[PDB]
């Protein structure tokens, strides 16, 4: 039993970017609820730029604000700040940050009629993923382990805030 991927990953990315672009104008599609499907990819992509955000506040602006204190640069510095920490900590949040950073900037550039930049960003992303993050992706089996990473959100006993039952007094 060897299931093959019908659509290319770039098509999914385009669907995600396109969806986000449509979501801010006219919601087109449906509401996936009760009905387990064999497509965790689209769900994972959605969660990649919706999970942490819904438990954050407005990462799309906050993350760019809290890190806007130090003199940065253009897009060449945005996606580069994600890879910066990737070099010394390929944690799940780094993979998510790398994807959301590119997706957000690309979606914005698409609306700004800057496909030229989008193509460059995507080109660099693919190159990086098949060069420096090649072994990492090979270890994670692509998005294999990622599917189990976004399974929950409140379940964490590493550094999660100790409140209520745990630490009531402080």
């Amino acid at each position: 039993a060897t299931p093959a991927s019908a659509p290319d990953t770039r098509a999914l990315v385009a669907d995600f970017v396109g969806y986000k672009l449509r979501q801010k104008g006219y919601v087109c599609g449906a509401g996936p609820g009760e009905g387990p499907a064999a497509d965790p990819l689209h769900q994972a992509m959605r969660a990649a730029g919706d999970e942490f955000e819904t438990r954050f506040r407005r990462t799309f602006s906050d993350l760019a604000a809290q890190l806007h204190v130090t003199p940065g640069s253009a897009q060449q510095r945005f996606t580069q700040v994600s890879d910066e920490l990737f070099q010394g900590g390929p944690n799940w949040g780094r993979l998510v940050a790398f994807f959301v950073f590119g997706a957000a900037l690309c979606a914005e550039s698409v609306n700004k009629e800057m496909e030229v930049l989008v193509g460059q960003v995507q080109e660099w992303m693919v190159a990086y993923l098949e060069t420096r993050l090649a072994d990492w992706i090979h270890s994670s089996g692509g998005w294999a382990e990622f599917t189990a990473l976004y399974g929950d959100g409140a379940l964490e006993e590493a550094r999660r805030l100790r409140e209520g039952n745990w630490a009531s007094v402080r």
């Binding site: 438990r55 510095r77 700040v81 994600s82 910066e84 010394g88 949040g93 998510v96 999660r160």
Partner: peptide, 20 residues
């Protein structure tokens, strides 16, 4: 370039996502 800055978004994102 700026690992300190990268670490900021990293740690903040990691903690916030998994319920800060």
């Amino acid at each position: 370039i700026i690992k300190n800055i990268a670490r900021h978004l990293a740690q903040v994102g990691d903690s916030m996502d998994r319920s800060i």
